[PDB]
Design brief:
The structure is a homodimer of 99-residue chains.
Chain A (H helix, E strand, L loop, with lengths): L1 E3 L5 E6 L2 E7 L7 E3 L8 E7 L2 E15 L2 E10 L4 E3 L1 H4 L5 E3 L1
Parallel strand pairs in A: 3-8, 4-7
Antiparallel strand pairs in A: 2-3, 2-6, 5-6, 6-7
The complex binds ligand 3NH.
Subunit structure (chains A, B): Homodimer, whose active site consists of two apposed aspartic acid residues.
Protein name (chains A, B): Protease
Organism (chains A, B): Human immunodeficiency virus type 1 group M subtype B (isolate BH10) (HIV-1)
Chain lengths: 99, 99
């Protein structure tokens, strides 16, 4: 779909059986999801942006469906204010920026 | 142009007669630039990011050329990790996400 930027580019994703609302973010190298339980083992990581840094748990090879398009990659879980889908998964669904 | 997201979507912007590099950020509602001198008055603005809130200075009606496209809008100046081109300016140059 062609998404305009008059409003926040939010989409529905499905992970671990549940459906969620996430923000497509070209500025984010990674993908961070709000506190949730995912299977597998994790590695701690610190990510920072505006406001500072937060500690997250890094899970690899996680399967996510973005607008029906399945994608697989690293997913960070932590105290983020909004679920954010970054470049690591956007490229997998063939997302591009046009102007 | 069409920008893929395999690497950071960095563009050069021209502001105040000088070139700077900025990141096209669809997850950012606003445009925030690193510390610099802009003309006129500024009013305060608190913006929230990944690590919390920061206080920035807001300058309105600022001429900024992005990748050759001229835009005139609100720019926030503060302690940001990188220059961020947000949705307020992405819509002015007609930028959309496609997949
Ligand atoms: N290293 C890098 O690429 O991203 C950092 C680390 C990371 C990892 C996962 C998800 C996000 C991020 C960070 C990003 C990615 N983009 C920004 C700006 C940035 C870019 C590069 C390096 C540091 C910081 C901003 C991000 O899009 C958030 C996403 C978000 C949306 C809503 C609430 C919280 C976060 N939006 C935001 O801060 O919004 C505003 C600033 C101006 O208008 C408001 C970040 O803070």
């Amino acid at each position: 779909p062609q998404i305009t930027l008059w409003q926040r580019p939010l989409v529905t994703i499905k992970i671990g059986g549940q459906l969620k609302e996430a923000l497509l973010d070209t500025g984010a190298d990674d993908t961070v999801l709000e506190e949730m339980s995912l299977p597998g083992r994790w590695k701690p990581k610190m990510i920072g942006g505006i406001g500072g840094f937060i500690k997250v748990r890094q899970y690899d090879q996680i399967l996510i469906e973005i607008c029906g398009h399945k994608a697989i990659g690293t997913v960070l879980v932590g105290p983020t204010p909004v679920n954010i889908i970054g470049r690591n998964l956007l490229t997998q669904i063939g997302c591009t920026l046009n102007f």
